[PDB]
Amino acid sequence: MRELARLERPEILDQYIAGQNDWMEIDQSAVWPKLTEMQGGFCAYCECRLNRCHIEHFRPRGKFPALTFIWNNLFGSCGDSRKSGGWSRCGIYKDNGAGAYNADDLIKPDEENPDDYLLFLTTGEVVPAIGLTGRALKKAQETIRVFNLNGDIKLFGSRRTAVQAIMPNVEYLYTLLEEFDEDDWNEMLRDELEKIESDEYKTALKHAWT
């Protein structure tokens, strides 16, 4: 899960007002290009490459009908609500599978840095960060549970495999620390960390590199 940089309020959300209008009315293809600009065609929560995807209300439309056409509330989640098939993480699971949760006890990735709360082990389990207590621990614990970031086997497997593929490259970089000078070695690490912005599960790969 990544720290996101939201900026531009798109034009079409000004036209529709909550209470008067319903969500199903809107042209969703107007919304996507700025979410794609934000997220880089990855999921907000798991960091999969998007292909089956939907617009996700962070605070849901049942509980919070005021937050409906609000740009801060919208995110691009993986999975498709319409399609005749089960999806079991991220947006779809928060609503259906997770059940009871407080929305204040979740990491909103645009507001906060998730890197303070979440740690990705190279075994492909996501855990609370080293040294947390109280509310910060309860956020880290609930975010993992509600988005189902270890329960989804397809996710757990895909992430584990991604990391395991690069652990030859990580071990080999840090050996050549010894012989190389600092400025050239720092360029080597900067190069690797630049590449993985194009890659799937980039936060989990980051923690393997850094």
């Binding site: 082990l121 075994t123 855990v127 895909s158 652990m167 071990e171 840090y174 050996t175 620390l177």
Partner: protein, 506 residues
């Protein structure tokens, strides 16, 4: 080129329309690979189930060649095959006899238990060339004690089967093979063409039947005009003590020739020697690690022998898995030879074959081979199969796979293909991505030690503390010095030490 219209004109009246019907059924071409391809293919295109067993509503599109259905226990994989087999029973019944009745849905078991509307429907659509793009059939049953009974709609199946039956009666044609091989396959007068349809949709593929049949064919084919044969028999009779065995053989040959001569077009068939050869080749082509099969009588009993992995052994030395699979292929080949007398290669005939749990009793080694050659040996058969094996799935293209979601509450409308390509993929990936199973058992504590070890390393700024050392020693003690797990632990230590050193060099 509408087949039904041509046939109706034939029935009312005449030679032209007959020829058109016959050509529609018989015409085909040999492709670039040297395989015969019918111009008008016959296969199941779509299946819909309504309030049938666990399904409230389910729709399945099938592949022309191979469809593999996967899912957990109790997802309804067997139910799907049963539904299809009952539908196919109506074709078989009507090919055999005008107005023959196929099988029906059970009023006790086949209606979904909590169906508000107390009846079940199995709707199938078949394809038979561009002339007959849609052959819809529906099997229906109302629950017991319902006032209003729901009628099955089977006339289209009967109409098509009538065309096969009537045209065959006038002039021999090749006929479609329909067979079901369920899990019961594992459990312990002269031959006539339509015996190929006997017990085809339940009771097929039993090893003892094969062995008996095979020995019989061997004895008959151990050692040609009728008038010439009659003359030879007469000459041999006049000579008749040492020639008595030869006379008896020739009398048998004469009787067989007369019988074949007397026998009808509708029962006309390949020689026992040819039949034997085709079945032998089918077995050797399809079955893993069998290169040859033959009958010996030299020890004084009749024994079927096989060359298994280069060693000549008795068929009783085969594993149960290999026996069951050998029986399936042999049975199928036998039926195809009987039903496709006019083809150069009778195994290039048309048909629909259903196989439940294809991996039944097979060791992983043979699971890696079973599907490879099945489609090469039977190129025009539509296979619909069920499996639980990632090893089998590693040999099949994702387009052939239809998966039930693990959380399927039996309301879902479609079965769909997996997102990942399975053919050529690693089994561990198929387990996780397609079959929703962890590559390591989560219920075993030792499966979590490496994860825990990593967390301990990260808690102590990358240095191996007393606690991390204890766990390291446990990993070493349990998995061994050469284990992948220990190597991973070693790697973690090395990387984390180096990261920490860098951090100190601030």
């Amino acid at each position: 080129g509408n087949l039904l219209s041509a046939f109706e004109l034939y029935q009312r009246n005449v030679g032209e329309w007959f020829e058109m019907c016959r050509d529609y059924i018989q015409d085909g071409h040999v492709d670039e690979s040297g395989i015969f391809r019918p111009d008008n293919a016959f296969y199941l295109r779509r299946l819909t189930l309504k309030d049938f067993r666990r399904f409230s509503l389910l729709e399945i599109k099938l592949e022309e060649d191979l469809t593999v259905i996967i899912g957990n226990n109790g997802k309804g994989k067997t139910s799907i095959l049963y539904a299809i087999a009952k539908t196919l029973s109506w074709f078989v019944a009507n090919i055999l006899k005008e107005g023959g009745s196929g099988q029906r849905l059970s009023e006790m078991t086949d209606i979904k238990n909590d169906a508000e509307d107390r009846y079940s429907d199995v709707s199938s659509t078949f394809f038979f060339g561009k002339g007959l793009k849609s052959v819809p059939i529906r099997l229906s049953r109302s629950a017991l004690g319902t006032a209003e009974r729901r009628d099955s709609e089977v006339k289209p199946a009967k109409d098509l089967a009538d065309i096969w039956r009537v045209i065959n009666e006038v002039n021999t044609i090749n006929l479609p093979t329909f067979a079901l091989y369920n899990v019961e396959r594992s459990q312990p007068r002269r031959e006539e063409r339509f015996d190929a349809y006997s017990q085809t949709l339940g009771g097929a593929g039993r090893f003892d039947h094969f062995v008996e049949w095979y020995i019989y064919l061997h004895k008959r084919t151990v050692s040609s005009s009728i008038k010439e044969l009659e003359q030879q028999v007469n000459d041999l009779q006049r000579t008749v003590v040492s020639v008595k065995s030869l006379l008896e053989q020739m009398k048998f040959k004469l009787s067989e020739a007369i019988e074949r001569n007397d026998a009808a077009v509708s029962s006309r068939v390949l020689t026992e020697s040819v039949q034997k050869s085709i079945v032998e080749k089918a077995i050797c082509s399809v079955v893993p690690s069998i290169s040859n099969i033959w009958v010996e009588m030299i020890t004084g009993s009749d024994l079927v022998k096989v060359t298994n992995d280069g060693h000549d052994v008795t068929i009783d030395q085969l594993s149960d898995g290999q026996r069951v699979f050998l029986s399936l292929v042999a049975d199928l080949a036998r039926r195809m030879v009987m039903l496709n007398p006019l083809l150069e290669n009778p195994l290039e005939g048309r048909g629909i074959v259903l196989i439940d749990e294809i991996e039944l009793h097979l060791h992983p080694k043979w699971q890696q081979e079973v599907i490879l050659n099945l489609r090469s040996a039977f190129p025009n058969i539509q296979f619909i199969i069920t499996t639980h094996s990632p090893i089998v799935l590693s040999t099949i293209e994702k387009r052939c796979i239809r998966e039930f979601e693990p959380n399927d509450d039996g309301d879902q409308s479609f079965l769909d293909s997996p997102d990942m390509q399975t053919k050529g993929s690693e089994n561990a990936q198929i387990l996780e991505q397609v079959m929703n199973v962890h590559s390591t058992p989560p219920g075993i504590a030792e499966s979590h030690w490496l994860g825990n070890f990593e967390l301990l390393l990260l808690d102590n700024s990358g240095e191996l503390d007393n606690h991390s050392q204890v766990l390291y020693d446990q990993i070493k003690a349990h998995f061994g010095i050469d284990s992948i797990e220990l190597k991973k632990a070693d790697s973690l230590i090395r990387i984390n030490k180096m990261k920490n050193k860098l951090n100190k060099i601030r």
